[PDB]
RNA sequence: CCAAAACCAGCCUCUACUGAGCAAGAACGAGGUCAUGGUUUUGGCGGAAAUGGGGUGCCCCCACCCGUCUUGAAACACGGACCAAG
RNA sequence: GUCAAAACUUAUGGGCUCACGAACAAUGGAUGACGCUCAAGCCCAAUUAGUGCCCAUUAUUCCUUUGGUAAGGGCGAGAAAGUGUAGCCCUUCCGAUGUAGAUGUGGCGUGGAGGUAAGGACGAAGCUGAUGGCGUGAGCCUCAGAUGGACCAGCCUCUAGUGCAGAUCU
RNA sequence: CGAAUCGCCACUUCUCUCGGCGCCAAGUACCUUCAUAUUCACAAGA
């Protein structure tokens, strides 16, 4: 009796992560020609298009845990950063836009693509799950752990670390930080700024570059 | 990472490409270079590794 | 990687092939991948290391298993 | 498969005759072993431990399990492709002949029959 | 190789306040290894010139410009550069190059040999394509002539990767490695 | 009976070059054979290098200079030494290696007329040097350095070049023949095969 | 059936045997056993003396070159048949049968001679740089 | 027991926009691999073989005498020839 | 560049340089050595080229161990309601360095005792050991003595004059 | 005494600024031996 509402449900998420799913591809593939639409209204109309700010970040701790200062030390805490090549995605409120402002060095970010965010969350995605961190393989293991019917998908996920979410830390919480592998073909430099050459602090939407080859 | 060759047409410097499909044609610069043992050369090495 | 001892030990048809009993040895390796931009490679051979005294020394890198 | 097959040596055995290979755990501030400098001696930890379903399982496949006396190998006769009787060192020849002639009735493997 | 610094050119503003309802644009021309240090140039410029700070500005437009076209051609980059050994030296040496991109990051090279200044330190102030004529400098000069004929004299010709060799017998090119 | 030894010819050959390449071939199982190792360059006038040597020579043990370094004055065991500060000179694998290299000033009779000798065109002098920056040929600046034997070298390559070329047209006739003999091969029944020569450029 | 033997190894292919006793043989490749199995190269053993025998598709380089064999029944090579008169007759029957389909092919005579040869790599050969 | 090949899985590697460029997205195809999982196959070896251990040597590589007080010990700082019993 | 893994001395990059040049006065001799000079130097940029590679106790992943006073499921031979053992079984997750120090340990080991169980003249203890085997380990076990000659291991509980390379220790 | 090694040559083996050949018929004609050595395995052969 129950073994089989278990199929009723389990063919009933899949019918919602398709519609989902669906929406979402959509509400990508919409979102963005309105978005050439303006930018290319704006050139015809010879006048620029003041395009939307990133309203999430995909901060990257980048040094290692050893010599980190006491201030430093607790933001990459409170930024769940707490090995190298950790991940999280962080909306850039003032307020973290000045922690990430306080522990550049120690990381690299920008401003995710919809592909690095899929990559992550597909490939690197771990729920917490009663405290264990558990690699995401189903979207029952999505919908359990979060007890929200908002939250169902694996899409949903990504929508939410990607548009910005109002479940954007409902979301981004219950995902254990990334594990990252160190980006392949190396850094740059960890002691340097992006714009000095180097690799730590904001560098824009190139992150998906540099945050590709560590996923 | 130019080899100089024997061969040159005349022209003027920054001149337009369908100026030179033109001057060399009228030569056969090109056809006739391939007839040196230096090109054959080339281009024999060119079969042998193809 | 063949060399040899110095005595005569089983070798893959020591029975079959009396003729083939040599005290010359053999260890085997797979190319493993390609090391540095150069044309070396890297072999492991087998679980064991390849000793120290093959070194400087004619390995032989044999053209199978084919792909081509 | 096990991890390390080598003792855990004491460190500089070698150039004491009384020392016991036997291991003792390093101390001093200065121990090359202690303070693991990468040429030195290893010293044993729980990162050594032998897996542990392969554990205690001699080549044999077998636990060995003590034997002293006939009646002992009743207690391998349902458990033994699990267990093979050691007889202890001390049993008589007279009394192994015992152990030995029905430790084969009964199927149970001996390590030293 | 392709040029060491694209051709940006960064568009951007104080973000809009009742303090200042209808902000400049400003446009701004930089050559930068990519667009993430040619925005950061601009913000460079933005607060040592305009007061305005990366926080309360909004770049419009981040884009590359398009080369003129592939012809050789003459640049004068107007190249200002800092040290502790010289702390502003405005500076018009001219470069042959077929773009301005090209010429800008020859100066870049030219600029850090002759004087151990970082990308940083310099601001290029221009970089127009020049006549043949205008350029006083002499070096340049010499490659103006319709007629130009130079020998490619004592080459060192290394071999196609593939075919290179560590030993060959003596006059031959048989090899033997 | 004679080994897989491939001789270097190291004339023109800039010093350090030719002895970082040669040392590694030496670990490579390579048994090379240098010869010519008067006509090694180095980069600078002989009076830059004279001092270098110079003060190579000054270094000596005061304890007991017997037992000191040693300052070896050809040109082939300076490059020997040369060759050996560029292999590991104490481990075996390195001090074999040295032993399989084999030195000569000149190239001496048992070496010459034994096969065609090797080049190293990355050691090349004009593939080093600025060409119109001076160059130390290296048995010149060791004539000045206590080499006794810059002359007889000299009077020994005159004696195998005056030779070799002696022999070069005593076979001038038979070289000849076989550039004949092979240009009326191409004439003769190899048809398709004259073709599939052709390209290829045969 | 199954197979994943690859596409550069076809029946009537020419290919070379890069290991066991006949080393350096040109061989056609005759069939490819019922199972995803090893190949049945054949010399034929009328050229290079290779008898019809197995070898796995890693052991031998499959050449462009190739013969339009498919006129010739190979179907007397199956698995349950791995010098007997059952055996020295098969090959009669089929080497025969494979010689003439290679002397079919215009340009049919080098490869006879082709088949005679025997590869190997000489010093200073680059077979990693050659094509096949 | 040693090998080798295969299969499946895993795993890994190898358009769009813009004005030719990107800050840009997949696809096809192929390869690699068991110090990955499961599927055998096929050969080689079989008084010996085989795997493991042990011993001795070598090779390449790594490696500062320990205890000690001390900020700091390889210290040109102290204690230290060997072993047994305590 | 060699030593030295990697540019088998890569660039189809720019300049600069002839004599030196490559983060924190006296034993002869130190860019680490050699050597390098169209660099193997310096500034700059690069990555196969106007169409990269090498090396960590690091990261990621896999296997194993151990810990968790962590999360769950379960109860041919096994399936124990279990802190801890040779762990009741399986699953997943996170952690692992460490002086002084603290603590744990069905942790090791010693002399003795209350028990239990067993062994020994067909050879106890002791000792010897290219005797292997087991255990991360302290160690245990077996084999062999061409050793010995009569005592004694296991297990639970009790006990202590209980574990030694170092005291200029006796 | 079983060995590892695996191109040769008086067409290179001078100098000073595509060497020839060899790779399975002593030749381009495939005459013609090869198996069971039974699909890798030191080439079992020099
Ligand atoms: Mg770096
Ligand atoms: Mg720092
Ligand atoms: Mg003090
Ligand atoms: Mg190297
Ligand atoms: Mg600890
Ligand atoms: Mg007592
Ligand atoms: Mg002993
Ligand atoms: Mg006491
Ligand atoms: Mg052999």
Redesign the pocket.
Known sequence: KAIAANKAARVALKKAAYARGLRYSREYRSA?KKL?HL??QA?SCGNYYLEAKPKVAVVTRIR?IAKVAPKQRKILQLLRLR???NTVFVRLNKPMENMLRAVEPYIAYGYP????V?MMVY??GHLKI??????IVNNQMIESKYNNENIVCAEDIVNQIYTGGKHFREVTNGLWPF????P???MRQKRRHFVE?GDYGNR???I??FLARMI | ?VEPLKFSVELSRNCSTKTLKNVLAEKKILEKYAATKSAR?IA??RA?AR | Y???G????????????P????????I?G?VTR???????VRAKF??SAV???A?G??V?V?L??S?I | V???????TR??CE??????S???K???????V?R?????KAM????????????????SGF??F?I??V?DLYMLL??N??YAG??????????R?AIVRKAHELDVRL??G | ????L?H?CVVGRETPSEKNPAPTVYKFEVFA???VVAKSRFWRMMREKNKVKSTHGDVLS???V??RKLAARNYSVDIAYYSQRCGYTHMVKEFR???K??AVS?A???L???H????HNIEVLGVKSIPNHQVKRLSISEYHASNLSFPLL???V?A??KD???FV??????AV? | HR??IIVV?L??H????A???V??QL?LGKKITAVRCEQLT???TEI?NKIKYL??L??????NPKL??FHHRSPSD?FL??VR?????Y????Q?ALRQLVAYEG?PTNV??????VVIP??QR??????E?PYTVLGNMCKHVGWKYSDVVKKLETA??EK??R??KK?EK??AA?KSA?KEALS??????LEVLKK??? | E?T?L??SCKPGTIAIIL???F??RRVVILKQLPR???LVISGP???????????????IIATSTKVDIKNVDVSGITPDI???DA??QL??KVDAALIEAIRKDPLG?EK??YL?????????DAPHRMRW
């Open positions: 963005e050439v930018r290319r050139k290692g090995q190298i090549f693509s919809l592909r690095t899929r490939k690197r009663n405290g264990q961190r558990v690699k594990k990252l592998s160190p392949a073909g190396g050459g824009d939407a190139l998906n570059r | 990472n050369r024999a090495k042998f | 063949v060399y040899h110095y005595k005569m030990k089983r070798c893959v048809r020591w029975s079959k092939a003729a083939r009993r040599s005290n010359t040895r053999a085997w797979r390609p090391h540095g931009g150069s044309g070396a087998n679980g000793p120290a005294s070194i020394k004619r032989r044999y199978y298993p792909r | 096990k991890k390390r097959t080598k003792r855990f460190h500089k150039l004491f005759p009384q020392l016991s036997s291991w003792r390093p101390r001093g501030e200065d121990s090359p202690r693991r400098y990468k040429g030195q044993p930890n729980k990162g050594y431990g032998s897996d542990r379903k392969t554990k205690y399982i001699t080549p636990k060995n003590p002293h006396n009646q349902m458990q492709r699990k050691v007889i202890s060192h001390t049993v008589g020849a007279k009394s002949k390590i030293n | 190789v392709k040029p060491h694209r940006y290894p990519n667009f981040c884009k590359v398009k080369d190059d077929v773009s991109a090209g020859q870049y090279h030219d850090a040999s002759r151990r200044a970082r990308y004592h080459r060192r290394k196609p990767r290179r060799v560590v017998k003596k006059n031959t090119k048989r490695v | 080994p897989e010819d004339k023109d800039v010093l350090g070059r002895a970082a390449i040392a590694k670990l180095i980069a600078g830059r003060q190579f000054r270094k000596r043990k005061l304890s000191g370094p300076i030494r040369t500060s560029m292999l590991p000179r481990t075996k694998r390195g074999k190239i010459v007329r034994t096969g065609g000798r990355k050691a004009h593939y080093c040097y600025r060409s920056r195998r070049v070799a070329a022999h070069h076979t038979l070289r076989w092979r003769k029944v190899s048809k398709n095969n290829f450029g045969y | 199954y994943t690859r596409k290991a066991g006793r080393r350096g995803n199995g090893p053993m009328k050229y290079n003396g290779v008898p019809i025998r197995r070898i796995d598709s890693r052991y791995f010098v007997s055996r020295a090959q009669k005579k006879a001679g005679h040869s025997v590869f190997t790599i000489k010093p200073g």
